[PDB]
Amino acid sequence: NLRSLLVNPEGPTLMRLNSVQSSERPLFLVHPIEGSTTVFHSLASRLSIPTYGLQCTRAAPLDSIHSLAAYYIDCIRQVQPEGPYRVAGYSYGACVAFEMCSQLQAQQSPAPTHNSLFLFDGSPTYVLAYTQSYRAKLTPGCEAEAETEAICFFVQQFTDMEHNRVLEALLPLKGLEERVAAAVDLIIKSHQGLDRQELSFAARSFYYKLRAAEQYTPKAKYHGNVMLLRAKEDLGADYNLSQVCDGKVSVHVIEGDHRTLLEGSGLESIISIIHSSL
Numbered sequence: 001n002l003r004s005l006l007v008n009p010e011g012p013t014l015m016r017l018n019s020v021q022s023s024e025r026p027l028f029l030v031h032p033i034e035g036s037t038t039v040f041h042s043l044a045s046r047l048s049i050p051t052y053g054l055q056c057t058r059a060a061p062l063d064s065i066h067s068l069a070a071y072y073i074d075c076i077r078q079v080q081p082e083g084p085y086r087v088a089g090y091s092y093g094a095c096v097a098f099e100m101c102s103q104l105q106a107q108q109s110p111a112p113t114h115n116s117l118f119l120f121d122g123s124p125t126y127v128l129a130y131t132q133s134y135r136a137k138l139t140p141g142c143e144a145e146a147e148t149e150a151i152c153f154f155v156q157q158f159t160d161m162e163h164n165r166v167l168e169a170l171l172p173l174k175g176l177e178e179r180v181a182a183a184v185d186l187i188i189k190s191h192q193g194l195d196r197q198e199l200s201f202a203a204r205s206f207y208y209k210l211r212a213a214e215q216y217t218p219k220a221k222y223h224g225n226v227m228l229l230r231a232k233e234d235l236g237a238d239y240n241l242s243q244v245c246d247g248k249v250s251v252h253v254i255e256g257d258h259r260t261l262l263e264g265s266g267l268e269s270i271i272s273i274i275h276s277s278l
C-alpha cells in the first residue's frame, strides 16, 4: 500500500506487467501522478494480451506533458516499433496517454491511425480542474506558497499530519529543494528504511508534474476515437473530452471511487471492456 506511491528513480521506464507472450499488440498503461505502475498490477495479471507499464523515473523529461509523451512513445518503440498502438492512462496518466496518441496521430497525419486510447478516470481537463482547485487556496504570484501546497499534499499521502502543521514547516524555507528535503525527513521519521533518493525524486517530481499539467493544451483536437472509464467539484459528463476530441467519445461509468476504480467491481468491467475492445 505504502511504497506503491513510489518509483525507483533508477528503474526502467518501460516494464512488463504480465507474462502473456503473443502476436497480439501490447497494451501500454501510463502511471498516475505518483509515477508508479503498481496501481495496474491486478489488471495486467488478468489480461490475456501482453501488458507493459510506463513509470516516471529520473530519465523522464517533466518540462511539459508534451516532452513526457514524446519520451514514452520512444520507449514503446523499443518493443513495438510500428502501430497500431493500444494506450491507457489512469488519473494524471489519462492526460499523458491522450498526448501520446495525439503525437502518434501527428506522426501519421493525416492518415487515420486505428490506435486504441482508454482513459481511466482522467482527461486533459480533469487534471487541470484539480490544479486550479489548489491555486484557489493560494496568493497569486507567490511561488513559495504553491511549492509548499504541492509538497504538503505529497507528504499527506504518506503521513496522518494535519494540513496546517505541514504547511507551517514548509512555508518558511528558502526554495523547492529545501521543502523537498524537509518532506523526505518527515516521511523518513515515519518510515526510516525508505530510500532518501527515492523520496527526494518523488517529492521534487510531484511539483514539476503538477506544473506540466497546468501548462498543457493539445496543439489541436485528438481525431481518433477515445473511451473514458470514469469512477462512480464535478468536471462534466465526458470530463470535457468533447473540447479536445473531434472523434467518437465513448463514456462508461465504472463502480468505485477514483482510487478503487481499478479494483473489485470496477476492475471486472475494465477487463471486459479491454478484452472486447481488441
Ligand SMILES: O=S(=O)(c1ccc(-c2csc(-c3ccc(F)cc3)n2)cc1)N1CCOCC1
Residues within 6 Å of the ligand: 032, 033, 091, 092, 093, 126, 127, 130, 131, 132, 134, 135, 138, 146, 147, 149, 150, 153, 210, 258
Ligand atoms: O493526478 S490528479 O489529477 C492530481 C491533480 C492535482 C493535484 C494537486 C495537489 S496540490 C496541487 C497544486 C496545484 C497547483 C498549485 F499552484 C499548487 C498546488 N495539485 C494532485 C493530484 N488526481 C486527482 C484525483 O485524485 C487523485 C489525484
